[PDB]
């Protein structure tokens, strides 16, 4: 297999909410989206977590 | 949004005439040797 | 030897000839034609033998039209081998001939000579032949 997935975590409360897929070999940039966070109850910026 | 076009003139050198339409506006009323009524295929 | 230059799929389903001649029902180019009364498979080798018989007996005056063609291939498992474990290689091509297909037909040469040419042809083919003439 290839372990291409990755995990997004909120920055205010630092939980590890979301899971997605990203191909490092092309876009080395760290993803920074903004999605719903269950603890914070609103759309917060999520950034990647190892 | 483009180069500063304008209504530039011209200057004939042999036909004793003139033209004025548009070009780069840094050289208004420019003279050229072979004029509008110069080339034999144009007249004759 | 008549043989398609190249085919898509090398090992197809065998075509049963038990019918009444879809297509090629009637003679279409010459005055006389050879018809079958029992459908069968005649390979390229038999078409070659029939063609050369007609040509040899036809002389340098007339024309012969072959209507059928060995479109379909056919396989043959190599000898002294158990069954299963694959499908055998293709060996020889064959033209399916339903009952009543005008397969050979001749032109531009006297009557009796054409009848004799056709009889000399149909003895190479397995199908029980018959003689038909063009309509009008």
């Amino acid at each position: 297999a290839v372990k291409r997935s990755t995990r997004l975590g909120c920055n205010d409360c630092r939980e590890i909410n979301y899971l997605t897929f990203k191909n490092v070999k092309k876009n080395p940039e760290k993803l920074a989206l903004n999605k719903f966070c269950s603890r914070c109850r609103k759309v917060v910026v999520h950034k990647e977590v190892k | 949004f483009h180069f500063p076009s304008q209504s530039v003139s011209f200057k004939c050198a042999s036909c004793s005439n003139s033209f004025t339409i548009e070009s780069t506006l840094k050289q208004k009323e420019i003279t050229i040797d072979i004029c509008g009524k110069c080339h034999p295929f144009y007249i004759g | 030897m008549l043989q398609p230059k190249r085919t898509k799929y090398r090992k197809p389903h065998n075509v049963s000839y038990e019918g009444k001649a879809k297509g090629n029902s009637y003679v279409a180019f010459g005055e006389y034609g050879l018809v079958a009364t029992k459908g069968n498979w005649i390979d390229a080798r038999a078409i070659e033998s029939a063609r050369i018989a007609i040509s040899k007996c036809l002389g340098k005056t007339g024309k012969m039209w072959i209507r059928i063609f060995p479109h379909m291939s056919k396989t043959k498992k190599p000898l002294e081998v158990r069954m299963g474990s694959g499908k055998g290689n293709p060996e020889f091509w064959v033209a399916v001939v339903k009952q009543g297909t005008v397969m050979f037909e001749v032109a531009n040469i006297p009557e009796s000579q054409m009848i004799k040419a056709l009889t000399r042809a149909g003895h190479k083919l397995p199908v029980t032949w018959k003689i038909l003439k063009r309509e009008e």
Binding site: - | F1, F3, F19, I21, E22, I32, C38, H39, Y42 | -
Partner: protein, 175 residues
């Protein structure tokens, strides 16, 4: 402006030349395009910028560069890597950049004798090719390391080519 001469005389002239009784059955010149085909940008010779700048210089239209719609392995042009450039100029610009050729440029050609006997499409178009862009006045001696020509077209609003003959003759083109 050359448009002045047209809207002053040509309508009546070609209306009487052919029995029409419809003031605008006369052919109307609709657009002019300019193309060069800058294919010496295999990967990056000067990346087309010289062509863009010079074509901007000649015409008030801002040039646009087309991307390849094909894939060709014979060269380094496959599925992208924009080549060439294109101007489609009209309005006052169409009439004026036209005469600016015929009254300035073509007398400055290497040899301007005659054409247009067989260059019609047969549906009301015409084309002119130039082997070098250095001839035209709206440029200085400095250019790209190579000097290329131009491809210009005259398309009108008629499909019968003899009408295009009539329109271009009424406008004093070198036949």
């Amino acid at each position: 402006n050359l448009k002045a001469h047209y809207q002053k005389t040509i309508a009546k002239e070609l209306q009487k030349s052919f029995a029409f009784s419809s003031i605008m059955q006369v052919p109307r010149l609709e657009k002019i395009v300019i193309n060069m085909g800058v294919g010496d940008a295999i990967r990056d010779s000067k990346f087309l910028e010289s062509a863009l700048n010079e074509l901007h210089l000649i015409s008030g239209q801002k040039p646009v560069a087309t991307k390849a719609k094909n894939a060709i392995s014979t060269y380094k042009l496959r599925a992208g890597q924009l080549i060439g450039c294109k101007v489609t100029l009209r309005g006052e610009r169409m009439w004026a950049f036209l005469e600016k050729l015929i009254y300035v440029a073509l007398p400055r050609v290497r040899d301007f004798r005659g054409l247009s006997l067989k260059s019609f499409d047969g549906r009301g178009n015409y084309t002119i090719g130039i082997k070098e862009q250095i001839i035209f006045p709206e440029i200085v001696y400095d250019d790209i390391k190579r000097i290329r020509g131009f491809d210009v077209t005259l398309v009108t609003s008629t499909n019968k080519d003899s009408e295009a003959l009539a329109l271009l003759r009424a406008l004093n083109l070198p036949l």
